């Protein structure tokens, strides 16, 4: 298991524009197009992202290309962020993937807001971080995914994904 396989499980793959759990236009492997209520605004973000006139449909190669870019971007946002970078550097390889997963889902700003959990993660207080992570809109809105990510931080193994 790795970050790509982990996010593919959590995000799924859809080749036509769809609404995510929050109701936002999305495509591929959780690639958010726009928070705007307009399907035309989504189609236009999609064409610009892909570089061709898509009419709301992309191929598997194209979905995987956006995915690679988004994972790369999530990693780069962690490393550029003063709050996230030291947590990431402190973590083993498996828990690093859990942090990337969170950033991919909710953005670097959203994750940097988990100040108390991040401190507990840095201190390697795994059971306590797991309890604090669960006290969140994140956990209450997407509990099955959040539980898999929290388990990964708690145990440092891929058991929630096998
Ligand atoms: Cl893009
Ligand atoms: Cl979920």
């Amino acid at each position: 298991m790795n970050i790509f396989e982990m996010l593919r499980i959590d995000e799924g793959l859809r080749l036509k524009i769809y609404k995510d759990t929050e109701g936002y236009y999305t495509i591929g492997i959780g690639h958010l197009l726009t928070k705007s209520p307009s399907l035309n605004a989504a189609k236009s973000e999609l064409d610009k992202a892909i570089g061709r006139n898509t009419n709301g449909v992309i191929t598997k190669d194209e979905a995987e290309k956006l995915f690679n870019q988004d994972v790369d971007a999530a990693v780069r946002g962690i490393l550029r962020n003063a709050k996230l970078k030291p947590v990431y550097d402190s973590l083993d390889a498996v828990r690093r993937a859990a942090l990337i997963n969170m950033v991919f889902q909710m953005g670097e700003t959203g994750v940097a807001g988990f100040t108390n959990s991040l401190r507990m993660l840095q201190q390697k207080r795994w059971d306590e971080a797991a309890v604090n992570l669960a006290k969140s809109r994140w956990y209450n809105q997407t509990p099955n995914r959040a539980k898999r990510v929290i388990t990964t931080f708690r145990t440092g193994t891929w058991d929630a994904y096998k």
Side-chain angles (χ1 to χ4, degrees):
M1 174 79 52
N2 53 61
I3 187 57
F4 291 91
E5 292 178 25
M6 188 199 202
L7 283 164
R8 170 75 186 72
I9 288 157
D10 285 335
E11 299 288 359
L13 163 78
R14 296 176 78 176
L15 297 183
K16 163 99 259 274
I17 293 177
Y18 66 95
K19 299 204 191 155
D20 72 2
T21 64
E22 295 299 318
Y24 305 130
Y25 291 118
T26 303
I27 195 140
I29 301 152
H31 182 83
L32 172 73
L33 291 167
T34 187
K35 299 192 195 165
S36 159
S38 168
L39 179 65
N40 283 312
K43 287 175 157 206
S44 156
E45 291 296 310
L46 181 57
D47 286 350
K48 155 167 85 71
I50 295 302
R52 74 182 173 75
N53 229 103
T54 63
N55 207 25
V57 183
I58 64 171
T59 69
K60 192 189 175 77
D61 290 353
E62 284 171 336
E64 287 186 345
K65 186 177 210 179
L66 292 175
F67 186 38
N68 284 321
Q69 286 169 181
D70 290 345
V71 173
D72 205 31
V75 175
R76 285 187 282 98
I78 288 162
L79 302 176
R80 283 199 272 94
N81 184 291
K83 288 87 192 277
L84 297 177
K85 184 173 184 290
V87 179
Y88 186 90
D89 287 347
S90 76
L91 294 172
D92 58 275
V94 177
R95 300 189 166 89
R96 281 182 189 176
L99 195 61
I100 302 172
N101 192 308
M102 293 188 69
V103 171
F104 187 102
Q105 180 183 3
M106 76 194 98
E108 90 173 61
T109 310
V111 185
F114 281 66
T115 308
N116 300 326
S117 302
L118 294 178
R119 192 171 67 253
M120 286 165 201
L121 287 170
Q122 202 164 346
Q123 302 177 78
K124 312 205 177 285
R125 287 163 140 89
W126 311 125
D127 279 8
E128 296 125 285
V131 170
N132 187 267
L133 284 162
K135 304 190 183 152
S136 58
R137 181 190 192 266
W138 171 60
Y139 177 91
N140 288 101
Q141 298 301 128
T142 50
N144 290 346
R145 192 222 187 110
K147 285 187 195 148
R148 285 191 293 272
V149 176
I150 292 165
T151 297
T152 304
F153 277 130
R154 197 182 35 94
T155 67
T157 68
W158 294 114
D159 294 349
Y161 290 87
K162 305 179 297 223

